[PDB]
Amino acid sequence: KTRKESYAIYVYKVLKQVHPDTGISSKAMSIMNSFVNDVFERIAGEASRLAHYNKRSTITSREIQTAVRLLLPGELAKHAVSEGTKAVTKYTSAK
Amino acid sequence: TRKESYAIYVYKVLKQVHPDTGISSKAMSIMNSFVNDVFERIAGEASRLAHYNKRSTITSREIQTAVRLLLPGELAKHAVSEGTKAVTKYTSA
Amino acid sequence: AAAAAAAAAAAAAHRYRPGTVALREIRRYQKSTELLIRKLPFQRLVREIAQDFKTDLRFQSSAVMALQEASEAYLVALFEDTNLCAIHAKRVTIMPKDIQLARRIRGERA
Amino acid sequence: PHRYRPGTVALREIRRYQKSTELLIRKLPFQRLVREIAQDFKTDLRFQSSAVMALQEASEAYLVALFEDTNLCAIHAKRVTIMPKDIQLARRIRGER
Amino acid sequence: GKGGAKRHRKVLRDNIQGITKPAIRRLARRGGVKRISGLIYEETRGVLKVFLENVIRDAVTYTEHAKRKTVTAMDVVYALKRQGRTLYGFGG
Amino acid sequence: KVLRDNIQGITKPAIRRLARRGGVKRISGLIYEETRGVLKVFLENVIRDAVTYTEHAKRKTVTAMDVVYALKRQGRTLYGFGG
Amino acid sequence: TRSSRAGLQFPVGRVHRLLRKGNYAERVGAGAPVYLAAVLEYLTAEILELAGNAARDNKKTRIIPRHLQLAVRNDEELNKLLGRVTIAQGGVLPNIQSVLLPK
Amino acid sequence: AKTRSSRAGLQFPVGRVHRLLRKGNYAERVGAGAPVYLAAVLEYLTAEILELAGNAARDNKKTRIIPRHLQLAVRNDEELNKLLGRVTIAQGGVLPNIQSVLLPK
Amino acid sequence: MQIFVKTLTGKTITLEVEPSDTIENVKAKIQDKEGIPPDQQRLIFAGKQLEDGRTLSDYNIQKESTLHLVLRLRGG
Amino acid sequence: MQIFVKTLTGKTITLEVEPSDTIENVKAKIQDKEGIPPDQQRLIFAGKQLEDGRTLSDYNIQKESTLHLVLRLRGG
DNA sequence: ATACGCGGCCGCCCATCAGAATCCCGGTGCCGAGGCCGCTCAATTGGTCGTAGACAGCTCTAGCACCGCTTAAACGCACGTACGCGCTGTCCCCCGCGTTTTAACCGCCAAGGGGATTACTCCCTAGTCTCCAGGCACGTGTCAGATATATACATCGAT
DNA sequence: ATCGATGTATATATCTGACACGTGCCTGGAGACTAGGGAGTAATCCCCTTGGCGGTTAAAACGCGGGGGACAGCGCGTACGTGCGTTTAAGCGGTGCTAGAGCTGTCTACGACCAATTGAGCGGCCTTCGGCACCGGGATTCTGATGGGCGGCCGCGTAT
């Protein structure tokens, strides 16, 4: 049949996590995937840009790390890094 | 080690059109910058479109529309023309 | 000794009448979220110009729906500043120019 | 004895100053200021003298543009002198902030 | 001064005469100004026209770079994206 | 020594000249102070963008090159000094 | 397996693929797919709930478009991040300008 | 002819621009007359801009061309500065233009 | 003053021009007579291509000179 | 009025707060007597974990209410 | 002829039976999480060769910092004229509202254009080889423009 | 009504240091060969957009008049630009140093590539309990025709 994949499974549990027996319209659901896919290119594209400025050829986590910092304002940014840094840190701990 | 410039290509065409005339060293640099930016917005444009309908190729038409949109009218249309003629020029040869 | 009372508002309540609706409609319009402009004249307006730039045109149901959304939203936004400008001026009246400045400084207007 | 009628000098320069390219901001103070904040993220870092200019140009022009928007709005009101709000008004409408 | 097999057909869906004036004021109050000038609202449609063309200009172009007869709504989105008025809700 | 008494460096006249460049005719006392605040806002954000790459690059002596890309990010591209 | 080992709610083995197929740099750093899933989940969660608050503010069981922007438009931060990204069936905050008072 | 540029009759570098289209990651396959087309295009644009730049230099009593000469050249033409409207200029300088009403009676 | 242009067929047309008139103005006049756009015209006299932005006086073109109209030599 | 919280220890604590006042504001006053962060403390009423920026009227709080308390886990 | 009797009517409080009306116990309609499902097509598992890239090494650029004579720019300070701006007052351009007429909207019924998938081969490119001249560093000088200094007119305002 | 003082343009030659040149070497450009999968084209089908149609039924669409906001007049106030004098600090090009950029050379970690196996994910389909607002049965309270006994009808009526 057709494809047209989306992030619907990811957005839904997140909302469950923050009000479990709280609801949503089928119109705000796409707004959400539209919103995510939009932020996706915003961050990953910028990573691509720096990589081939100061003369290197792969994109790691550090770059995102840097990228994120100047893409967003002071207070959210730090918490965001923190969360980000740990999630991965744990990831490696396992293996 | 090998500083690149598009100064060489400007250098001829300058003379071709205003031979009693010259370029500032920074004015040329400005032009070097300009072309590349100009090279990238288009190239960027080109790439997005390729991807949109999954096109593992930037053909000679993908660029053409790209320019058409990117550019304000009077300038855009002349450039469209020079473009095809060139293909015209080159393939048989 | 029976004295039917004027307790209910009717059309004499709600303070007086001066500038009475002025702010009223505003509020009701805000709570709502329906299209400000009709969805039938707009539909042809596009079909009609779209022909001038190309022939044999077709349209997705939504495509217009979407434009309506864009446009409406586009104007409101405009007016929203216009209003400010208007206020700046000692006025509560949007004016033919009030429109221009707004645009001029945003930059589409020269 | 003679003193120019008000508004006779200011325009004259406007233009003189409009024709030319040369920067208006000072080389030393600018630099110090740039150093002041940069330290406040990380302390004691260096920049090529030009790198400083690169920065100097991008903002000098930037103001002059805003002042231009401020002026129209001063005009729109039947006024004559760029007031404060106009700048802010301008800032709010551009919706940069 | 004759009946003369007279038939009357004039055009008021698409054309700007046809469209509804309240449809605008409806729009004007959401912003919440107290007063509407006659002069003004005429200009406003004026601009609408200016905004509307450029988009379709592009729309048309993307419909046509792909050799398609049916104009996609996505096609409009990118258009909006190019001017920096991109619409969430649509066509990821 | 942490640089301070900086904000003033941009004295009365220099802010004013910009404005003439702008095509303003005259100017109230109050806004010399207002603009300095913004100027600062603008520098902060750009330098904020710039500095990170420089750190990213394992270096201190932050380049003109960063000044610019950092400007390209905020959306103030510059023709003149770069690459 | 990805969510597990990583410990996130987002798909770590999905954004890795697109980042390599988008064609960003030559190869891809091992850092990113994982890190990139993480912040994304973090943002995902930051809106849902304020949207929740907004629906409860005016007392509603289900959240809908109207809510989402109400949530974001009012918030100082999110609002700037999505400053010029404009929004489906959204309408607007109540706003009454000062000198437009009914005295 | 050996040099490609010449087979397409041009000053712009055919092959240098081809490689730049492969070192920029823009895509998996590079087209064959794209490169040329593109080279030639810019060629025009340069010219287009560089054609009046010189004329501006003629205007002000010089045989050379300093950057402002590029700046005025771009601002006046509507189809020129329109595209570059997002371009700000190494020491660009300013068009003399004084608003209507502050000029004096 | 008049100049002449020998068109592709060999047919000569007369244009009324000044020596300070630009090559594009003359190409616009040829567009006005022949329906050939300025961009497809090359104006030749005796081993110089006349260039856009330059004047008739830049090439010392004076009274009752004949210019040769050619289209665009395409490698085929 | 009176607001009641049931702790994990089980011990019942009685403190008096205006109903107009927001829950978050009231928590701060109860976190100065016990010297314990409001963050750390988790409260549930009638199968709903307490929500920040929710007024007591919107929570239909009653005098002598019974609210379950949960201690918090962050692993790291 | 002359006086007594009364007769159903009538206001009275005082008795009978069903109708209306609130609380005690209520069902219905609409939305939104669970759960089932099942072929399957996109990620994961276990794994070598090599190449970017970090790193260890180095020197020789360029980013600071200082020093002192000169001087262009910044300051502080004092005056007044011509601007902001609040007051004031009418005339007329919008609102609000009463009715008359238009066109929006929903529902129905039609037909084929065009969009998406599938199946196949051959045109077009990167990727790989060999060889060479265009293009740069290397070297060097002039000529385009920048400064200082003489020379006359404009021009806005004071009288 | 003529005049002066200033500011701006413009004249002069002239010296200098950056733009242009020529040379010469080497890495980036051209040509030659192949293989394979990208991308077109050529074939079918059925979904989607356009259209027409009636019919109400609320809105569009008007006007008129007068109220209320816009704009023109007026008038006081004071604050900023234009210029002067003193003082304060950048800018100017000079030196001197070493720190950090840039080069450079081998190792190696980590990603791309090829292989095979299974379950996370989407549409499509399907589920029951809980809350909004309409609603159901029984005892109980207030209205309506009934009815003899005590009083009053003054007006027809029979008896001596």
Residue numbers in the entry:
A (entry chain D): 28 to 122
B (entry chain H): 29 to 121
C (entry chain E): 26 to 135
D (entry chain A): 38 to 134
E (entry chain F): 11 to 102
F (entry chain B): 20 to 102
G (entry chain C): 16 to 118
H (entry chain G): 14 to 118
Give verbatim lines from the article:
The extended family of ATPases related to the yeast Snf2 protein acts to alter DNA-protein interactions. At the heart of all these proteins are paired domains capable of rearranging during the ATP hydrolysis cycle to create a ratchet like motion along DNA in single base increments. The yeast Chd1 protein is a member of this protein family and acts to organise nucleosomes over coding regions.
Conditions were established to favour binding of a single Chd1 to modified nucleosomes that included an asymmetric linker DNA extension of 14 bp in the presence of ADP-BeF. Three of these were combined and reclassified as six classes, one of which was selected for refinement. Density for ADP-BeF within the pocket formed by conserved residues from ATPase domains I and II is well defined. However, within the structure presented here residues ranging from 632 to 647 pack against the alpha 1 helix of histone H3. On the unwrapped side of the nucleosome, the ubiquitin peptide is displaced across the lateral surface towards the DNA. The unwrapped DNA is oriented away from the lateral surface and this positions the DNA backbone at SHL6 in contact with the repositioned ubiquitin.
